[PDB]
Enzyme design. Structure first.
Site, mmCIF file in Angstrom:
data_model
loop_
_atom_site.group_PDB
_atom_site.id
_atom_site.type_symbol
_atom_site.label_atom_id
_atom_site.label_comp_id
_atom_site.label_asym_id
_atom_site.label_seq_id
_atom_site.Cartn_x
_atom_site.Cartn_y
_atom_site.Cartn_z
ATOM 1 N N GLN A 285 0.824 -1.206 0.000
ATOM 2 C CA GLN A 285 0.000 0.000 0.000
ATOM 3 C C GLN A 285 0.859 1.256 0.000
ATOM 4 O O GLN A 285 0.564 2.220 -0.717
ATOM 5 C CB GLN A 285 -0.931 -0.008 1.215
ATOM 6 C CG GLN A 285 -1.924 1.139 1.302
ATOM 7 C CD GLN A 285 -2.673 1.373 0.012
ATOM 8 O OE1 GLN A 285 -2.335 2.268 -0.758
ATOM 9 N NE2 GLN A 285 -3.697 0.566 -0.233
ATOM 10 N N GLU B 165 -3.306 -6.606 -2.860
ATOM 11 C CA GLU B 165 -4.563 -5.915 -2.612
ATOM 12 C C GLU B 165 -4.964 -5.176 -3.883
ATOM 13 O O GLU B 165 -4.282 -4.212 -4.266
ATOM 14 C CB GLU B 165 -4.411 -4.944 -1.448
ATOM 15 C CG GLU B 165 -5.625 -4.082 -1.137
ATOM 16 C CD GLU B 165 -6.937 -4.834 -1.242
ATOM 17 O OE1 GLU B 165 -7.161 -5.769 -0.448
ATOM 18 O OE2 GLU B 165 -7.753 -4.480 -2.114
ATOM 19 N N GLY C 197 1.681 -6.668 5.537
ATOM 20 C CA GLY C 197 1.934 -8.049 5.165
ATOM 21 C C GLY C 197 2.722 -8.172 3.874
ATOM 22 O O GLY C 197 3.816 -8.741 3.854
ATOM 23 N N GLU D 171 28.139 4.509 -7.398
ATOM 24 C CA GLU D 171 28.875 5.447 -6.560
ATOM 25 C C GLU D 171 28.351 5.423 -5.133
ATOM 26 O O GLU D 171 29.128 5.438 -4.172
ATOM 27 C CB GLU D 171 28.750 6.855 -7.136
ATOM 28 C CG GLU D 171 29.884 7.787 -6.801
ATOM 29 C CD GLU D 171 31.081 7.569 -7.688
ATOM 30 O OE1 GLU D 171 30.894 7.305 -8.894
ATOM 31 O OE2 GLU D 171 32.208 7.656 -7.174
HETATM 32 N N1 LIG Z 1 4.513 7.368 3.682
HETATM 33 C C1 LIG Z 1 3.471 6.558 3.520
HETATM 34 N N2 LIG Z 1 3.326 5.454 4.333
HETATM 35 C C2 LIG Z 1 2.268 4.628 4.173
HETATM 36 C C3 LIG Z 1 1.324 4.878 3.193
HETATM 37 N N3 LIG Z 1 0.390 3.907 3.254
HETATM 38 C C4 LIG Z 1 0.722 3.049 4.242
HETATM 39 N N4 LIG Z 1 1.879 3.486 4.825
HETATM 40 C C5 LIG Z 1 2.584 2.831 5.936
HETATM 41 O O1 LIG Z 1 2.421 1.434 5.810
HETATM 42 C C6 LIG Z 1 1.977 0.864 7.021
HETATM 43 C C7 LIG Z 1 1.036 -0.293 6.721
HETATM 44 O O2 LIG Z 1 1.788 -1.286 6.066
HETATM 45 P P1 LIG Z 1 1.588 -1.629 4.507
HETATM 46 O O3 LIG Z 1 2.760 -2.417 3.975
HETATM 47 O O4 LIG Z 1 1.383 -0.357 3.722
HETATM 48 O O5 LIG Z 1 0.239 -2.499 4.458
HETATM 49 P P2 LIG Z 1 -0.200 -3.138 3.053
HETATM 50 O O6 LIG Z 1 0.713 -2.676 1.948
HETATM 51 O O7 LIG Z 1 -1.642 -2.798 2.769
HETATM 52 O O8 LIG Z 1 -0.033 -4.720 3.253
HETATM 53 P P3 LIG Z 1 -1.294 -5.669 2.972
HETATM 54 O O9 LIG Z 1 -2.415 -5.342 3.926
HETATM 55 O O10 LIG Z 1 -0.893 -7.115 3.125
HETATM 56 O O11 LIG Z 1 -1.733 -5.398 1.554
HETATM 57 C C8 LIG Z 1 1.313 1.979 7.800
HETATM 58 O O12 LIG Z 1 1.596 1.855 9.173
HETATM 59 C C9 LIG Z 1 1.942 3.240 7.250
HETATM 60 O O13 LIG Z 1 2.927 3.709 8.139
HETATM 61 C C10 LIG Z 1 1.463 5.985 2.371
HETATM 62 O O14 LIG Z 1 0.627 6.215 1.501
HETATM 63 N N5 LIG Z 1 2.541 6.825 2.539
HETATM 64 N N1 LIG Z 2 41.044 20.113 -11.246
HETATM 65 C C1 LIG Z 2 39.816 19.539 -11.267
HETATM 66 N N2 LIG Z 2 39.551 18.542 -10.388
HETATM 67 C C2 LIG Z 2 38.345 17.938 -10.368
HETATM 68 C C3 LIG Z 2 37.318 18.381 -11.315
HETATM 69 N N3 LIG Z 2 36.231 17.626 -11.085
HETATM 70 C C4 LIG Z 2 36.535 16.774 -10.076
HETATM 71 N N4 LIG Z 2 37.793 16.965 -9.647
HETATM 72 C C5 LIG Z 2 38.463 16.209 -8.567
HETATM 73 O O1 LIG Z 2 38.240 14.814 -8.757
HETATM 74 C C6 LIG Z 2 37.943 14.178 -7.516
HETATM 75 C C7 LIG Z 2 36.816 13.188 -7.748
HETATM 76 O O2 LIG Z 2 37.348 12.144 -8.553
HETATM 77 P P1 LIG Z 2 36.492 11.477 -9.737
HETATM 78 O O3 LIG Z 2 36.066 12.519 -10.740
HETATM 79 O O4 LIG Z 2 35.300 10.726 -9.196
HETATM 80 O O5 LIG Z 2 37.563 10.471 -10.382
HETATM 81 P P2 LIG Z 2 37.175 9.562 -11.644
HETATM 82 O O6 LIG Z 2 36.207 8.488 -11.215
HETATM 83 O O7 LIG Z 2 38.432 8.933 -12.187
HETATM 84 O O8 LIG Z 2 36.534 10.415 -12.708
HETATM 85 C C8 LIG Z 2 37.555 15.266 -6.535
HETATM 86 O O9 LIG Z 2 38.334 15.139 -5.343
HETATM 87 C C9 LIG Z 2 37.870 16.578 -7.220
HETATM 88 O O10 LIG Z 2 38.826 17.311 -6.452
HETATM 89 C C10 LIG Z 2 37.682 19.474 -12.241
HETATM 90 O O11 LIG Z 2 36.862 19.902 -13.079
HETATM 91 N N5 LIG Z 2 38.914 19.986 -12.157
HETATM 92 MG MG LIG Z 3 -3.073 -3.796 1.561
#
Ligand SMILES: Nc1nc2c(ncn2[C@@H]2O[C@H](COP(=O)(O)OP(=O)(O)OP(=O)(O)O)[C@@H](O)[C@H]2O)c(=O)[nH]1
Ligand SMILES: Nc1nc2c(ncn2[C@@H]2O[C@H](COP(=O)(O)OP(=O)(O)O)[C@@H](O)[C@H]2O)c(=O)[nH]1
Ligand SMILES: [Mg+2]
Ligand SMILES: Nc1nc2c(ncn2[C@@H]2O[C@H](COP(=O)(O)OP(=O)(O)OP(=O)(O)O)[C@@H](O)[C@H]2O)c(=O)[nH]1
Ligand SMILES: Nc1nc2c(ncn2[C@@H]2O[C@H](COP(=O)(O)OP(=O)(O)O)[C@@H](O)[C@H]2O)c(=O)[nH]1
Ligand SMILES: [Mg+2]
EC number: 3.6.5.-
Lengths: 51, 438, 427, 430, 427
Positions: free
Chosen positions: D11, D62, D135, D245
């Site tokens: 849900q 459901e 559930g 990442e």
């Molecule tokens: N943030 C958010 N939480 C929800 C929502 N609906 C239900 N919940 C959470 O889900 C809990 C109920 O468990 P669920 O897994 O959603 O129940 P279900 O999916 O209907 O499971 P079944 O009855 O077996 O179908 C509640 O206590 C809520 O905290 C929603 O629309 N938004």
């Molecule tokens: N000089 C420079 N350094 C950079 C730039 N962008 C990212 N870095 C450096 O690169 C590091 C991140 O490494 P990353 O880009 O993930 O390495 P890669 O996976 O090999 O591409 C960071 O610590 C930055 O300081 C840039 O445009 N110029």
């Molecule tokens: Mg349900």
């Protein structure tokens, strides 16, 4: 992936880095009788950092 | 960077906060909705320093202030007033029930729950600013919220923010014109915490500002609104050296080293020199030597004490407007050669002079008139020992056979905590006497 | 081949230097940008003394601006002649000393005295041969006093054979501005005795007497005091920047003034000060300049020269003059008033003539006088200190940043020895 | 080519996925009928000519919730047979959804997983969505995760599950269903991200200042967390953080893979103009304990490892400068043997706002998923509630009679009993 | 007749080299399309060092772009100056290392190391005489570090008589981007000490400190950090592509700067860095280049050069200049502070002249330094490596790929051995 513009390139001073242009100038501004001061895009962190 | 965080506790703090932030908005031209006008903001979008506002996004300013009070019906008037869109909505802190003139409730029972939420926004305002100079505290020690929550909040900022100045503008019970019965109890317990926590405390008295309004303003019918609009004029003139520049700037940290000689002695008097109505301002010649004489008059003091009884330790002069830096110097020589006032023998240089280049902005609908000059006088005097001794006498009268104690005892506090504040105030009383002794 | 590095400290030091660089730049023809536009070729002969040649013909001053409050760094560059200064030299703090000598010298110095040395080391290295260093500050506050003396202590240990000009204002007798002013002066003069090779004494209320009576300005601006100081600071180095009949560098001024190492405090006056209403009627001659030179009220110090004898004096004449007229006039003032000059030093007054006068005046002179009359000023500062220190008033702040009461007692050890060592030659 | 397959069980699974896919279709410009008017291939399959289907299955025993999707506004979006239904639900019984009624549907689910896996070229991981209180969320979730590990070895199993709160809980036998779920989710799920209803209850109360929010308001900002995790695959950035990442950068030990979740800017419409949103403020707000999506106190625990997903206008210094301030903060604490602890990712696409939602348009956002030793506080409360009801064998005849043997309760308790001992061992300073 | 094959690995290496070919093609006059539009004859005379002739005047870089994810390859091609590269050289995997060093070295990198060695061979025997191989990568990642050292180990066994330039960004003290930097760096440096011939050490926070304190750029992204590296990249090989008064090729820099075969890690720094508002004040002449070149703030590594003595240094000067002034400038800096230079090697600095300055400047310099201060950046990675390895944290990912704990101990011992001999020369 979708291409997006890098947001850091909006700074006017960064449009030409590592070039010697001596005629680039800095503006100032005054806030209603307050202290006249240098105008940058973020001058506060350059002046007195943060925290 | 120059920036202060203002906090306002209690009913008197909010009403002063409404008047002060009305003055700050007209100082910087901020409209009530929170937006500077489009012609002003055409310049640089950077805001390198503003001691009372922080730039938010594009053209929006929020005050660096929190409005904490246990009673919701006073901060809700700010929340529904003409300054609704200015203040950050989370910054205004309300509560369920007020402390109701009880230091015990504001410090132990009901003030403990809201002080954690108050510290959350203080931390959120501390990291947002870069150069923090001090905290401005506005409360009245006669009330439960001002005394109880004021003592609890100032205790937490002492531990959390070490060595930061905490300048607290407090309202003390008047000898005659006072509105509560348990004001001597709440004020005595407040001085047990305000003595060591606050850095500089400026005394404000209720009937002394009443006497200024009756005499200087010829307003025969004054209210709290009229009082706070010139209490705010004291605060703005006190901090005008930060926001605007002058010949001799005086910061908040320049107050502390030049005004208080001893750590325990930090209670100050206050004076505003030109306080003139609209019809009297045109004919009167408001000269620098004229207002400097008026600042040191006993009538212009905002605390109901006679400075002739005591001796001035040090005096701070906050000059505003078109003031050349020698007619202030010519005024000091005339003030210091007078014998009616008395400077103490161990302080040869007693005057701290500061000049700002802007006249005070007049609040529209206000009682004060537009004046080219202003002198905000903050002085350290031994005449302030008269203020605490009178409150010591009233508190000892009711505590002689224990009136109004079951309210304080039942809400957390013990019986012996009353005697500790009494001894702290009594030991402070002889401290003022021994420093005035030659 | 001789150059001077300028350092400005505090609210007072920055505004004095900005007015100094207002005046010293125009007489060499440098505009607020840096381009030369003077009408004379002799102005470009010695640009190296106060300006560094840059690309495009721009001249940048050898100025280092220091403060603990960032407000003054707005105050310098946004005023007139504010764009000449190097933005790298704009080194500053964030909190402000707040008129505390302990904050400037002990706590807030340590994060900034390392940074200001890097600017000075860079500027000293770029030079070829340093004539000396020149600082201007205040002894009343904390930014220019505590941090200002801290740089002077740390620059003499690095450059011990170079001269040190200090233009320091002092607390005033009549009226003051800061309450703890005797505390800040007594600590700063205690440091200034052993390191500063020569010291110039200023005070605002002697300049108030000069501005109100001699110049007769009705409402003098706070910068009008600075213009009297700025004309002096250009006048001490006037022989360096321009040729003259009698060459006298900073060393020749130094070696002729001080008889003994500890008497390096001087009081200074500026001669051709006349109101604009009477500038037509005044004839500027050598007897006119000398008569205004030796006047007590023309001095820029609160010490009356009539009280104490002149130990040694020096005059720096600018303009077209005669060597015989200058020399016979200086012998006249010694013979007419021999009681006001010391007996065991013959030929007290050493004079120098420079052939380039300042702008707007055909003749000018700057007077330097080392006299025992200045002990009245230092005793007046000391008697204000002993009133406050005996009850430890305004002392919990100063001991807050680390210093003990022992350094306060040692401050009066060298202060009272200084006034006693001045006293032994007056009798 | 990158792709990811998301499954939804229970849900809570369908309703969250009903809120996840309405955010996914808005980010990629997909209309509700299924026609766009290159980046969509992570979640959508290109079908025929100008038409897309979600790479998802909605399975639930459901049929009422599944039929709501069939009659809903997204009837033309989903392929009709991915909306897998059952005759009758497990009905708050782990034994029903794992032994008796779960077996008739788990074969059809595995067959359709294979048909989705064949379509995608490179599969990075599986997204599961379930609630352990029910559930089929527990039972069928345990059965499908067990079979998917054998069928697809060495492939990441990214777990998005909801645990019962200490206070707010809507059924009685939830501690029974939760404990048996943790036994299966321990070794089969590669990475588990905890969610708690009562913590997300408090976030809408304090930050979004709405005093009557429902399950729809929670799941709308659940989808903001899920989209922020996988925004690296869909959109480019300065520092991409893929699914694989996220495994080796957050999971130090094989048995320690449960993690906390946090989304930093939770701002209403009127709160947006007043508050100055910057990188330093949201990084402070991300580590704020009331912003955590699972009800626990991170001050009690130790931050084992942290991950940051920055979406929008974020420059790489401000993420680096704020981390320096967070590392120097003393109210939080990192474990001693992990000095290098911060994994950061910057995505250039700002988050999108749903019409009728509560979250306001923000230029930058942070999703913070971290491993902490404070997660053992959640397991202690569920163990205490389970041990109280199992003290004298209550609500046990439903489980025993439906296939499960009695000792299966005991071995699942011992699995959690050793799980608490491992957190205090790894959290102990050496 | 000397040419360099460029190899780029990982997201960092793809992004760093994309800006590297941006500044080289702009220096040599190649337009974004691929043709030649330069107006100088000296640009086209040496283009075989970095470019291959194609049909119609097209020039293609000698760049093998290698990684494990297709996302970084498309970003490089989509950007400006990204269409000059050869699409056949775009070799890549599909799954991605995920910053697992064992995955890029053993599991995933194995089936791509045959494909990337196929194309670097195709670049090798196509050209005449290889000067060496230039590779740019990271040490904290897994795609450019695990697979990058796999390529370097194989390319050293294939061609063992050629140069090897590695530009490796190292893990940072203050900040981290991943969690497994100490695991990847200690494994990578263990492979780099025998395989690589000389190493450039880079670090992001020193690039961050340069673009904040010196350049006064308040919001620089990765875009201009690589621009700082790109100017470093072009400064190393400026002797090859352009003539000069004193020519020093990559072998001459290798023999001078490496005293002993394990002394090959260097830090680097670009000389003429000035903020945009302060360009007019700063003159552009060799003495003020030298003071910025030797400044500790100008080093692009985390190591402070003041802590350790300089074993050997070199300056790569570009522009119109005088050898008589540069030689005495390098002599003066060795005599001003002789404590910071090692004693048993006289003339620790070898300087070279290139007559063609970089674009936009009339003078520039590049500094390569071999000092024992690099033991600081290594030992803190070793300190962080021993913190996690004793608890075996984040190790089940690495040991699931075939590398057991034996190689981790061997990398730890070699890392401790490398810092053991750095300190033996400081004493
Ligand atoms: N943030 C958010 N939480 C929800 C929502 N609906 C239900 N919940 C959470 O889900 C809990 C109920 O468990 P669920 O897994 O959603 O129940 P279900 O999916 O209907 O499971 P079944 O009855 O077996 O179908 C509640 O206590 C809520 O905290 C929603 O629309 N938004
Ligand atoms: N000089 C420079 N350094 C950079 C730039 N962008 C990212 N870095 C450096 O690169 C590091 C991140 O490494 P990353 O880009 O993930 O390495 P890669 O996976 O090999 O591409 C960071 O610590 C930055 O300081 C840039 O445009 N110029
Ligand atoms: Mg349900
Ligand atoms: N100047 C000024 N003083 C005020 C104002 N309102 C109240 N006061 C002072 O405050 C006293 C009344 O107690 P308060 O301090 O206002 O009470 P409180 O701080 O709200 O504490 P609780 O009533 O218990 O919540 C009066 O005696 C006044 O002197 C005001 O608007 N202006
Ligand atoms: N003559 C002159 N005096 C100044 C100037 N600025 C400040 N002062 C004097 O310096 C004294 C206080 O200096 P202060 O501001 O406290 O110095 P700081 O705080 O250490 O930087 C005051 O009494 C002023 O009279 C100036 O521009 N000219
Ligand atoms: Mg009240």
């Amino acid at each position: 992936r979708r291409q997006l513009h890098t947001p850091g390139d909006a700074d006017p001073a960064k449009e030409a880095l590592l070039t010697w242009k001596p005629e680039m100038r800095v503006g100032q501004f005054v806030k209603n009788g307050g202290l006249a001061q240098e105008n940058r895009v973020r001058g506060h962190t350059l002046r007195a950092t943060a925290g | 960077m120059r920036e202060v965080i203002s906090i306002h506790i209690g009913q008197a703090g909010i009403q002063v906060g409404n008047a002060c932030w009305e003055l700050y908005c007209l100082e910087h031209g901020i409209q009530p909705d929170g937006q500077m006008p489009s012609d002003k903001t055409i310049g640089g979008g950077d805001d390198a320093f503003n001691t009372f506002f922080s730039e938010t996004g594009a053209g929006k300013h929020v005050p660096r202030c929190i409005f904490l009070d246990l009673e919701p019906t006073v901060v809700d008037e700010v929340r529904t007033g003409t300054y609704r869109q200015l203040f950050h909505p989370e910054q205004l802190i309300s509560g369920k029930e007020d402390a109701a003139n009880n230091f015990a409730r504001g410090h132990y029972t009901i003030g403990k729950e809201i002080v954690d939420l108050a510290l959350d926004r203080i931390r959120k305002l501390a990291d947002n600013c870069t150069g923090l100079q001090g905290f401005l505290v506005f409360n009245a020690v006669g009330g439960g919220t001002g005394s109880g929550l004021g003592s609890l909040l100032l205790e937490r900022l002492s531990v959390d923010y070490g060595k930061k100045s905490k300048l607290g503008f407090t309202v003390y019970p008047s000898p005659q014109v006072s509105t509560a019965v348990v004001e001597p109890y709440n004020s005595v317990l407040s001085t047990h915490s305000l003595l060591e926590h606050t850095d500089v405390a400026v005394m404000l008295d209720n009937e002394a500002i009443y006497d200024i309004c009756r005499r200087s303003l010829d307003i025969e019918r004054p209210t709290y609104t009229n009082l706070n609009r010139l209490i705010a004029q004291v605060i703005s003139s006190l901090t005008a050296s930060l926001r605007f520049d002058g010949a001799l700037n005086v910061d908040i940290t320049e107050f502390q080293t030049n005004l208080v000689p001893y750590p325990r002695i930090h209670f100050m008097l206050s004076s505003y020199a030109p306080i003139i109505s609209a019809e009297k301002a045109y004919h009167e010649q408001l000269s620098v030597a004229e207002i400097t004489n008026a600042a040191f008059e006993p009538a212009s003091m905002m605390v109901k004490c006679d400075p002739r009884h005591g001796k001035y330790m040090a005096c701070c002069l906050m000059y505003r407007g078109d003031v050349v830096p020698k007619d202030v110097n010519a005024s000091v020589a005339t003030i210091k050669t007078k014998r009616t006032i008395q400077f103490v023998d161990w302080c040869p240089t007693g005057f701290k002079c500061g000049i700002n280049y802007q006249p005070p902005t007049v609040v529209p609908g206000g009682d004060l008139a537009k004046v080219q000059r202003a002198v905000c006088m903050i002085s350290n005097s031994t005449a302030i020992g008269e203020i605490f001794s009178r409150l010591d006498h009233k508190f000892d009268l009711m505590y002689a056979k224990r009136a109004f104690v079951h309210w304080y005892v039942g809400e957390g506090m013990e019986e012996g905590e009353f005697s500790e504040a009494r001894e702290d105030l009594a030991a402070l009383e002889k401290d003022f006497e021994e420093v005035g002794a030659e | 081949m001789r150059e001077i590095v300028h350092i400005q400290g505090g609210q007072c030091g920055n505004q004095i230097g900005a007015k100094f660089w207002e005046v010293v730049s125009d007489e060499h023809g440098i505009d607020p940008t840096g381009t030369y536009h003077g009408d004379s070729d002799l102005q470009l002969e010695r640009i190296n003394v106060y300006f560094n040649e840059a690309t495009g013909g721009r001249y940048v001053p050898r100025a280092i601006l220091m403060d603990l409050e960032p407000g003054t760094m707005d105050s310098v560059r946004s005023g007139p002649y504010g764009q000449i200064f190097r933005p790298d030299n704009f080194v500053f703090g964030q909190t402000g000393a707040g008129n505390n000598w302990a904050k400037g010298h002990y706590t807030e110095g340590a994060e900034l005295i390392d940074s200001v040395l890097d600017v000075v080391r860079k500027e000293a290295e770029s030079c070829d041969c340093l004539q000396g260093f020149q600082v201007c500050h205040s002894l009343g506050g904390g930014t220019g006093s505590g941090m200002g003396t801290l740089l002077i202590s740390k620059i003499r240990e690095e450059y011990p054979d170079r001269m040190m000009l200090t233009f320091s204002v002092v607390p005033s007798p009549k009226v003051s501005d800061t309450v703890v002013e005797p505390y800040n002066a007594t600590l700063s003069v205690h440091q200034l005795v052993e390191n500063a090779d020569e010291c110039m004494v200023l005070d605002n209320e002697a300049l108030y007497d000069i501005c109100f009576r001699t110049l007769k300005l009705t409402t003098p601006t706070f910068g009008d005091l600075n213009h009297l100081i700025s004309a002096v600071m250009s006048g001490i180095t006037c022989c360096l920047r321009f040729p003259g009949q009698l060459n006298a560098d900073l060393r020749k001024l130094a070696v002729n003034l001080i008889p003994f190492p500890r008497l390096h405090f001087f009081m200074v006056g500026f001669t051709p000060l006349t109101s604009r209403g009477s500038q037509q009627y005044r004839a500027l001659t050598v007897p006119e300049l000398t008569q205004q030179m030796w006047d007590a009220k023309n001095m820029m110090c609160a010490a009356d020269p009539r009280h104490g004898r002149y130990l040694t004096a020096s005059a720096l004449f600018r303009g077209r003059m005669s060597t015989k007229e200058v020399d016979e006039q200086m012998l006249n003032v010694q013979n007419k008033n021999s009681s006001y000059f010391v007996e065991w030093i013959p030929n007290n007054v050493k004079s120098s003539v420079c052939d380039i006068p300042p702008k707007g005046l055909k003749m000018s002179a700057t007077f330097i006088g080392n006299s025992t009359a200045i002990q009245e000023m230092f005793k007046r500062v000391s008697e204000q200190f002993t009133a406050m220190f005996r009850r430890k008033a305004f002392l919990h702040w100063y001991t807050g940043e680390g210093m003990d009461e022992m350094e306060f007692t040692e401050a009066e050890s060298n202060m009272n020895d200084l006034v006693s060592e001045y006293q032994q030659y007056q009798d």
